[PDB]
Write a protein that binds this ligand. Structure first.
Ligand SMILES: C#C[C@]1(COP(=O)(O)OP(=O)(O)OP(=O)(O)O)O[C@@H](n2cnc3c(N)nc(F)nc32)C[C@@H]1O
Ligand SMILES: [Mg+2]
Ligand SMILES: [Mg+2]
Ligand SMILES: [Mg+2]
Lengths: 398, 558
DNA sequence: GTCCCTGTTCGGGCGCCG
DNA sequence: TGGTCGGCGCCCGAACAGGGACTG
């Protein structure tokens, strides 16, 4: 019925050929139930092995609902295929409008690139493969093709509410308002009822930055000054105003680490001036949409996680921290997955783009459990790094 | 017969043509077997005679089957496989008997001439041309092409596996409570029915497969235990691996070690305590398979204890989803680990081992975490869930490790078992400088051209020493300086270095390393009672880092 | 930039199964 | 006597990529 739009790949790039990873029994049973209903409704069709492409798939179950959400890891296909006032609203609600993509057909010559495989427990059966006939959820081209149809749906609601910003990214709809809690949720329900005519909770105001802080002591040892000098020396790469001349001359000689060193008047003021320079904003940092956002995370212990967002070295666009429970049953991997989801969400609100993460975790450790704590519809790109304990120390807190 | 299922469309790679390889000479015995097979396949339409309009050819040969009485027609399609399109393999792994659930009735059967019953794409058939010689000048060689899947072609396994799945799909939908383990053409069928009603359903399955052109000869129709399946023996309430025979040579070659370690890894799935570290080390630096290799004392001893394990009777049980999955891990030396997965004590579902060495420097806690992750992924494949663990590490030891470790690490639900050797950290670095300990300022420096270097220290108590080095690197000299300070210091020492490379290695608390220098450092760290390691930026005039830097740079820098 | 060191990935041999 | 194909497993070495230290 609806006319399709031709979509192609980048020049010199083939389709994705990523293997399927092991899936638990509950995810496989959920995917089989979902795929049968998607196949009955013409959304997907079975394919054979002559299609050489494949994309991994899994499923997430949101907290309090027996509903499962099919997630396709399309970030390899996406590689091969902004409202500034949004970050200033009291409340921003994220709506999952991925089901709206199933009403638009997909280009016939592109469907072979959406291939995925449903595994079986204990390899009872060979993998059973499918491909998409409509706009798939989590694909880069789905919001672009549906963009014209999305504006027609939101046009009356946007005109009736001019002070409400509605931003779309992937299968998500970000709706922010300055209304009071209660009036905001009532307005969100109006939007959901507005979306049902066609078919078929954040607070950016409280987002803060974590600046670099220096220790405050009455008695300083050689070791204290050596650690402070090393931290300021690294900080000078970000803040060129940082000086360490008067603090370094206190360390002349070959002294014991536990020897107490009195701070001179010049060194005392040099430390006080350095505290003011760290409070000033970083100079000359301009966002580049053509470049990728890079997010580094450092595990600080006791449930504390620091992160920085940049595109060039020492050109931080944002520095924050992420604290959680400090109990004994702490799951480092679970906390790390919650951290990357919050960092990605902030990057989508501020810049409308997902960052590339440098994760401080073994590759095997992450891939084994990260899908067990994922709740978003998108998946950022990431790499694994052996972080030196130096950058971990520089963003520490007292 | 030939299955009425639709063919899978297959193309060649762009700008490619079919193979043109002439037949190599064959034994008279093999020629007699091939002509008997091909005259019958030609009568059934599975192959078709071709004339001069087909310019292609590919060599053929034959080997014995597992029955040892029948022959298997093979084709050396190596050239056509290079020119055939890519496929996505649908076979994601191998089924394991430990994942089988208890069934009331069990049947194992096999399809006769499985490949030769699935039709091949008509446009691709000409590329499968082959020639069969005969009696010379009394009847010349006959040329054929394949109308069915050939044995030797790249696309045959995935096409058959996908076609077999489509064929079984109507039966599975009609009988969702009858489990059919489908590996190639080999079918394990289990039900919770009485043996009478079960065999009637088996005949429904055999009739269903026959309707889709797949015969099930009674010769390969197993009806009583033990069932021979996938290299195992399936009893009603237990399973075992078919007898494994290790080679018993007095002069082992690389190929002999390959088949030795291969059968040991295969045995480790049910035989506990298998080790292959010393036998696998003998393969380093080797070139060809014919390389005879002398066995070391450790390798000779490792094989001896492996042979004694294989003499004991062992078996596994089947999976009960109403019980928990338990994985207990035992430590052996040299980065080797073994584990037993069970639901009831002393009733192993399966066993295994983990001995992969990750990283140049590591400790027993890292390797244990890596083994837990390997068993977790393996358990999700076989049983679809994560097991509960029984680990030989104290809760306090783990709490200390992941508190100070900069990376995120986690172990699922587990408890401690006192089965030595226990996993522990062999030393801990202090968090604060040590009062009353001598403070060493260490540094190393090396010349890139001459490869000469110096390592040394200066102390707050007036001591200093410089050691010259030959054929070294800047990283090695910094490690040599730390090693020197550990040798000449007391039981408690403060060490200040400018090398984050050496700092990161020591902060991870390794107990084993590929570097002998690092191993020497580890032995020093274990003997100390308190060690504090601090870092300062190099070339910043900080004392006494400036003093030692000026000491080790003289004569190799500037 | 180069040199060094450490990480992952791919392909080679063998094992096992059809 | 070999000599074919695909899957998974193992361990090995070759060929990368990424980051720190270095020359003048
Ligand atoms: C599907 C399938 C099968 C089943 O193996 P079988 O051992 O069952 O041989 P059959 O073709 O089925 O003839 P049968 O003796 O059973 O009447 O796996 C494939 N296969 C088995 N052994 C080999 C082998 N050595 N090489 C290749 F390339 N394929 C094989 C091809 C075969 O058709
Ligand atoms: Mg057969
Ligand atoms: Mg078989
Ligand atoms: Mg140095």
């Amino acid at each position: 019925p609806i006319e399709t739009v031709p979509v192609k790949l980048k020049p010199g790039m083939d389709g994705p050929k990523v293997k399927q990873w092991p899936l638990t029994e509950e995810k496989i049973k959920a995917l089989v139930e979902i795929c049968t209903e998607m196949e009955k409704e013409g959304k997907i069709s079975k394919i054979g092995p002559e299609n050489p492409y494949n994309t991994p798939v899994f499923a997430i179950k949101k907290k309090d609902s027996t509903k499962w959400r099919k997630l396709v890891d399309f970030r390899e296909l996406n590689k091969r295929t902004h409202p500034a006032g949004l970050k200033k609203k009291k409340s921003v609600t994220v709506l999952d409008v991925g089901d709206a993509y199933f009403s638009v057909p997909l280009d016939e010559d592109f469907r072979k690139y959406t291939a995925f495989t449903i595994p079986s427990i204990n390899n009872e059966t060979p993998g059973i493969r499918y491909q998409y006939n409509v706009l798939p959820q989590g694909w880069k081209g789905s919001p672009a093709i549906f963009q014209s149809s999305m504006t027609k749906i939101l046009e009356p609601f946007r005109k009736q509410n001019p002070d409400i910003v509605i931003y779309q990214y992937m299968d998500d709809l970000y709706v922010g308002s300055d209304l009071e809690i209660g009036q905001h949720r009532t307005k969100i329900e109006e939007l959901r009822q507005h979306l049902l005519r066609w078919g078929l909770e954040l607070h950016p105001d409280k987002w803060t930055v974590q600046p670099i802080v220096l220790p405050e002591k009455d008695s300083w040892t050689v070791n204290d000054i050596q650690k402070l000098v090393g931290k300021l020396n690294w900080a000078s790469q970000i803040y060129p105003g940082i000086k360490v001349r008067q603090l370094s001359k206190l360390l002349r000689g070959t002294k014991a680490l536990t020897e107490v060193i009195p701070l001179t008047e010049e060194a005392e003021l040099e430390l006080a001036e350095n505290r003011e320079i760290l409070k000033e904003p970083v100079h000359g940092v301009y966002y580049d949409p053509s470049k990728d956002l890079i997010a580094e995370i450092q595990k600080q212990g006791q449930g504390q996680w620091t992160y920085q967002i940049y595109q060039e070295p020492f050109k931080n666009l944002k520095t924050g921290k992420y604290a959680r429970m400090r109990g004994a049953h702490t799951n480092d991997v679970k906390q790390l997955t919650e951290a990357v989801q919050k960092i990605t969400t902030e990057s989508i609100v501020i810049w409308g783009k997902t960052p590339k993460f440098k994760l401080p975790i073994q590759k095997e450790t992450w891939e084994t459990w990260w899908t067990e704590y994922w709740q978003a519809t998108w998946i950022p790109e990431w790499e694994f790094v052996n972080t030196p304990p130096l950058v971990k120390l520089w963003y520490q807190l007292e | 017969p030939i299955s009425p299922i639709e063919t899978v469309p297959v193309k060649l790679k762009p700008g490619m043509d079919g193979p043109k390889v002439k037949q190599w000479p064959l034994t008279e015995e093999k020629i007699k077997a091939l002509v008997e097979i091909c005259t019958e396949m030609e009568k059934e339409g599975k192959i078709s005679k071709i004339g001069p309009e087909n310019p292609y050819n590919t060599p053929v040969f034959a080997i014995k089957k597992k029955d040892s009485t029948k022959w298997r027609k093979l084709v050396d399609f190596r050239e056509l496989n290079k020119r055939t399109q890519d496929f996505w393999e649908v076979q994601l792994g191998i089924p394991h008997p430990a994942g089988l659930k208890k069934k009331k009735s069990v049947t194992v059967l096999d399809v006769g001439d499985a490949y030769f019953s699935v039709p091949l794409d008509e446009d691709f058939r000409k590329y499968t041309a082959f020639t069969i010689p005969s009696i010379n000048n009394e009847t010349p060689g006959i040329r054929y092409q394949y109308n069915v899947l050939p044995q030797g072609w790249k696309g045959s396994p995935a096409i058959f596996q996908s076609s077999m799945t489509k064929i079984l799909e109507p039966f599975r939908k009609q009988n969702p409570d009858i489990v059919i383990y489908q590996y190639m053409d080999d079918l394990y069928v289990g039900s919770d029915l009485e043996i009478g009603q079960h065999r009637t359903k088996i005949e429904e399955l055999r009739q269903h497969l026959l309707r889709w052109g797949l015969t099930t000869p009674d010769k390969k129709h197993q009806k009583e235990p033990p069932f021979l399946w996938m290299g195992y023996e399936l009893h009603p309430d237990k399973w075992t691996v078919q007898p494994i025979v290790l080679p018993e040579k007095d002069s082992w070659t690389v190929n002999d070690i390959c088949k030795l370690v291969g059968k040991l890894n295969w045995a480790s799935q049910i035989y506990p305590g298998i080790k292959v570290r010393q036998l696998s080390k003998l393969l380093r630096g080797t070139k060809a398979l014919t390389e005879v290799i002398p066995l070391t004392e450790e390798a000779e001893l490792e094989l001896a204890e492996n042979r004694e394990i294989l003499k004991e009777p062992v078996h596994g049980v089947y999976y009960d989803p109403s019980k928990d999955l338990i994985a207990e891990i035992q430590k052996q030396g040299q980065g080797q680990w073994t584990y037993q997965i069970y639901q009831e004590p002393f009733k192993n579902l399966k066993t295994g081992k983990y001995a992969r060495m990750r990283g140049a420097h590591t400790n027993d806690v890292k390797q244990l975490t890596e083994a837990v992750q390997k068993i977790t992924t393996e358990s999700i494949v076989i049983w679809g869930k994560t097991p509960k663990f029984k680990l030989p590490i104290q809760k306090e030891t783990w709490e200390t490790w992941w508190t100070e470790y900069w990376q995120a690490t986690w172990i699922p639900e587990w408890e401690f078992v006192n089965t030595p050797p226990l996993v522990k950290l062999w030393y801990q670095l202090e968090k604060e400088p040590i009062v009353g300990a001598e403070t060493f300022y260490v540094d190393g420096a090396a010349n890139r051209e001459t490869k000469l270097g110096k390592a040394g220290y200066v102390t707050n108590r007036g001591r200093q020493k410089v050691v010259t080095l030959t054929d070294t690197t800047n990283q090695k000299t910094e490690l040599q300086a730390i090693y020197l300070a550990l040798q000449d210091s007391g039981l408690e020492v403060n060490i200040v270095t400018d090398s984050q490379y050496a700092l990161g290695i020591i902060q991870a608390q390794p107990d084993q390393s590929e570097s002998e220098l690092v191993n020497q450092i580890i032995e020093q760290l274990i003997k100390k009672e308190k060690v504090y390691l601090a870092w300062v930026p190099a070339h910043k005039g900080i004392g006494g880092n400036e003093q030692v830097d000026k000491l080790v740079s003289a004569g190799i820098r500037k």
